[PDB]
Amino acid sequence: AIAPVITIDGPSGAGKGTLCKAMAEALQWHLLDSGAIYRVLALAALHHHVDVASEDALVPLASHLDVRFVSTNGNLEVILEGEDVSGEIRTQEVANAASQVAAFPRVREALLRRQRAFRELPGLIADGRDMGTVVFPDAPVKIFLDASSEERAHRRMLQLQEKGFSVNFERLLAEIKERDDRDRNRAVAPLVPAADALVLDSTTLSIEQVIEKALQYARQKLA
Numbered sequence: 001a002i003a004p005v006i007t008i009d010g011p012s013g014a015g016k017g018t019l020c021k022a023m024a025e026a027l028q029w030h031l032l033d034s035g036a037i038y039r040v041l042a043l044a045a046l047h048h049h050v051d052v053a054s055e056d057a058l059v060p061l062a063s064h065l066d067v068r069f070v071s072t073n074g075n076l077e078v079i080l081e082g083e084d085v086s087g088e089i090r091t092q093e094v095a096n097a098a099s100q101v102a103a104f105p106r107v108r109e110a111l112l113r114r115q116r117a118f119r120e121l122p123g124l125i126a127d128g129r130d131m132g133t134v135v136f137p138d139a140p141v142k143i144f145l146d147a148s149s150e151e152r153a154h155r156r157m158l159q160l161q162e163k164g165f166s167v168n169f170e171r172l173l174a175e176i177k178e179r180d181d182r183d184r185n186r187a188v189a190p191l192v193p194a195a196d197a198l199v200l201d202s203t204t205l206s207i208e209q210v211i212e213k214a215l216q217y218a219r220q221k222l223a
């Protein structure tokens with residue numbers, strides 16, 4: 001077959017970015033943070049004064065999106081039109097806009113080739129919502145990482161508190177349920193586990209346990 005792919009799909013703040021990175025490093029494979037692409041698209045829209053409420057306006061922006069990634073240094077660098085926007089795209093505001101633009105079918109379609117371009121040997125670890133169901137349906141290894149909304153909001157609260165940012169549980173939880181609801185209820189490419197995906201309920205599993213479980217499954221399936 002062509003290059004193998006390990007997909008990691010799941011709700012917001014489920015630890016997909018962390019797990020994807022750890023696996024790609026352990027296996028020495030390529031990585032794809034798909035969510036980062038929707039976030040950069042949303043950011044580009046604000047900069048270029050594109051109406052996020054209009055699918056017609058967003059299609060051109062998506063079709064000609066100039067986004068690139070750089071890593072293998074300890075963290076992922078997201079580049080928009082030649083500028084590092086790694087930090088700028090990690091906010092609730094951008095996340096919200098990314099989820100809104102992601103609901104448009106024509107926009108998602110315009111981004112398919114770009115994502116699928118990431119499949120290269122020796123392999124690709126793809127993190128997102130519809131990686132195992134729409135972007136890479138023939139993936140030999142599909143993982144669906146999940147955890148309760150309450151736990152996922154709690155983990156985010158602690159991450160922001162470490163950095164000294166103002167937050168309160170009620171908002172973070174509401175924000176998370178709001179975004180996940182949209183992603184799971186949209187008519188096209190909704191967040192849903194692939195029939196053949198291994199579901200990892202990590203509410204009470206540590207980071208290292210998840211990594212160990214995900215790697216065992218992939219190695220058995222791939223070899």
Ligand SMILES: Nc1ccn([C@@H]2O[C@H](COP(=O)(O)O)[C@@H](O)[C@H]2O)c(=O)n1
Pocket residue numbers: 012013034035036038039095098099100102103127128129130131179183
């Ligand atoms: N494969 C993907 C990755 C992200 N997304 C969208 O992008 C938003 C932001 O994703 P991340 O939180 O994973 O960065 C999600 O809420 C979702 O609406 C998607 O629809 N399909």
